[PDB]
Amino acid sequence: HHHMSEPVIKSLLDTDMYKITMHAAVFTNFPDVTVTYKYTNRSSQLTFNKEAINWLKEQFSYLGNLRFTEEEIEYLKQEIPYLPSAYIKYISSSNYKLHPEEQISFTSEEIEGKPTHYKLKILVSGSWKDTILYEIPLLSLISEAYFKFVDIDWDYENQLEQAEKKAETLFDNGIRFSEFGTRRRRSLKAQDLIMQGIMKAVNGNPDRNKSLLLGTSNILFAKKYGVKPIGTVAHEWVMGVASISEDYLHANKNAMDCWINTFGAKNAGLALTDTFGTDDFLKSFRPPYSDAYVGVRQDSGDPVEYTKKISHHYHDVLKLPKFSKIICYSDSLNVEKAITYSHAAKENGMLATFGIGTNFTNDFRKKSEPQVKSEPLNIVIKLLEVNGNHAIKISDNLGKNMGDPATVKRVKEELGYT
Ligand SMILES: [Cl-]
């Protein structure tokens, strides 16, 4: 007889802070809009078994049992005080919950020519306010499933020490960074152990190191370890804003307006510039917008080239003093890259911060072959459709786009790239 598994996702705060701020933004501005997200496994030679699938089915259902506790809501009000009152009331209500049975469509398919091996098919669809939170916990669960049931050639030895060493190097180089690895963690336990390592590093020289650790994107771990939760706007914000009525020409400005009108200009945070290409973004990035945002988040393309472009914009076009604004580098970082990019930022008169994700929470060697990498699962859950319209991303890697090709072509034309 089957015994029910212990739920892995024990809190609606076991997620990235950007999910909650998006949730507040979507609730506030677009409570009616409907969306679909889609899972994609970019590592398609990595496959699933029946055991993993059955555990996933169970774990997904448990998401429907979660509620924000009193202490959790208090934590949100304290650390994210600019969340609107009405949003807090909405998530505080006894009416609030996730409905995975209605929102998640999870099937699996035996792979042609690979019997006993399966690919996952996952669509998450419904009102945007009902669907926005699933991305992170679903990814966190799928990764955990894969390393629990499919690839077990690995263990936890030296995970804390490895994270500690990374953190110590970063701190010696005066690097201001946050942990950002929730979505691709090998397991909840893996992320907890790396949090332990980072804090062990901090507490070796807290007078110096406390101010270098910005915090973690994971609100639950921020709460647990007594550090700040860290978040920015995500791509899905301007993608949704554009797709609602397919006004791409004004989407960057409309998205900033809406963000600012929701949280307040002072709480605008870092701007994500590359969604429809950084050039389009820059056309509207002047006062008051460029004064409200405290900087920009770099998420694609060549980081050094990005840094030069942004520096010229701020210092030459906008006539701001050097070191007025931040670039946050967040695309597949490791310690050596963070150091290199910190140099480029300094050279170009920019303050630098870093979000370090998968390298923290999914850096494992094989147990069988300790010199060989145990590869992470390269999975995403991406916004696909909004009110029936295609959702797309251009990025700054200009021929590496996301979404319906015809739409991407049409948009590049409308925005003057082509
Ligand atoms: Cl898959």
> Rounded to the nearest whole angstrom, what is the distance from the C-alpha of residue 41 to the centroid of ligand 1?
5
CA of 402 to the centre of ligand 1 (A): 19
Residues 303 and 344 sit within 8 Å (Cβ to Cβ): yes
Angle between helices 303-311 and 335-347 (to 10 degrees): 30
DSSP state of 128: H
The CA-based diameter of the chain, rounded to the nearest angstrom, is 70
Taking each helix axis from N to C end, the angle separating 335-347 and 159-172, rounded to the nearest 10 degrees, works out to 20
Helix (H) or strand (E) holding 356, with range, is: strand 351-356
Phi, psi of 351 (to 5 degrees): -80, 145
Identify the burial level of 149 via C-beta atoms within 10 angstroms of its C-beta, where 0-12 means exposed, 13-18 middle and 19 or more buried: middle
Q: How far is the CA of 121 from the centre of ligand 1 (A)?
A: 7
Tell me how far apart the alpha carbons of residues 270 and 408 are, in angstroms, rounded to a whole number: 25
How far does the centroid of ligand 1 lie from the alpha carbon of residue 143, in Å?
10
How many other β-carbons are positioned within 10 Å of the β-carbon of residue 100? 20
Asked if residues 182 and 16 have their Cβ atoms less than 8 Å apart, the reply is yes
Enumerate residues with CB within 5 Å of ligand 1 (an ion): 41, 119-120
Pairing of strands 114-127, 34-41: antiparallel
Q: Before 31, cis peptide (omega within 30)?
A: no
> What are the sequence ranges of the domains in the chain?
1-418
Residue ranges for the known binding site for 5-phospho-alpha-D-ribose 1-diphosphate are 358
Question: Which residues is 177 bridged to in the sheet?
Answer: 213, 354
d(CA 12, ligand 1 centre) in Å: 25
DSSP letter assigned to residue 323: T
As a whole number of angstroms, the distance between CA 99 and CA 226 comes to: 31
DSSP code, position 269: -
Pinpoint the alpha helices (H) of 146-283.
Answer: 159-172, 188-202, 206-209, 219-225, 235-245, 251-263, 278-283
What residue numbers does the annotated binding site for nicotinate cover? 18, 180, 232, 297
Q: Which residues are annotated as a binding site?
A: 18, 180, 232, 297, 358
Dist CA 352 CA 329 (whole Å): 7
Q: What are 6's two structure tokens?
A: 């212990």
- Among 63, 88, 74, which Cα is nearest to 12's? 63
CA 249 centroid distance within chain: 25
CB 328 within 8 A of CB 342: no
C-alpha of residue 90 to centroid of ligand 1, in Å: 34
Alpha carbon separation from 346 to 64, 174, 315 (Å, rounded): 47, 12, 13
Residue 290 parent element (H or E)? helix 289-292
Q: Three-state SS for 157? A: coil
**How many CB atoms neighbour CB 242 within 10 A?**
26
What is the CATH number that goes with domain 1-418? 3.20.140.10
Ligand 1 centroid to Cα of residue 100, in Å, is 19
* Tokens matching residue 398: 């200009």
Cβ-in-10-Å burial (0-12, 13-18, 19+) of 49 comes to middle
Q: How far apart are CA 250 and CA 281, in angstroms?
A: 10
Please name the residues in contact with 204: beta carbons below 8 A apart, sequence gap of 6 or more: 168
Cβ atoms of 37 and 125 within 8 Å: the answer is yes
Vertex 188 angle, CA 100 and 8, to 5°: 35
Surface-to-core class of residue 146, CB atoms within 10 Å of its CB (0-12 exposed, 13-18 middle, 19+ buried): buried
- Between the CA of 15 and the centroid of ligand 1 the distance, in Å, is 22
Give the determination technique. X-ray
Query: If you compute the radius of gyration of the chain from its CA atoms, what whole number of angstroms results?
Result: 21
Please tell me what resolution, in angstroms, this structure has: 1.8
Report the Cα–Cα distance between both ends of the chain, in Å, rounded. 61
- Secondary structure class of 408 (helix, strand, coil): helix
The DSSP secondary-structure symbol of 386 reads E
* Residue 2 DSSP one-character state: P
Distance CA 239, CA 245 (A): 11
Q: What is each CA distance from 414 to 84, 279, 408, in whole angstroms? A: 35, 13, 10
Residue 53, CA atoms < 13 Å, CB-side half-sphere? 16
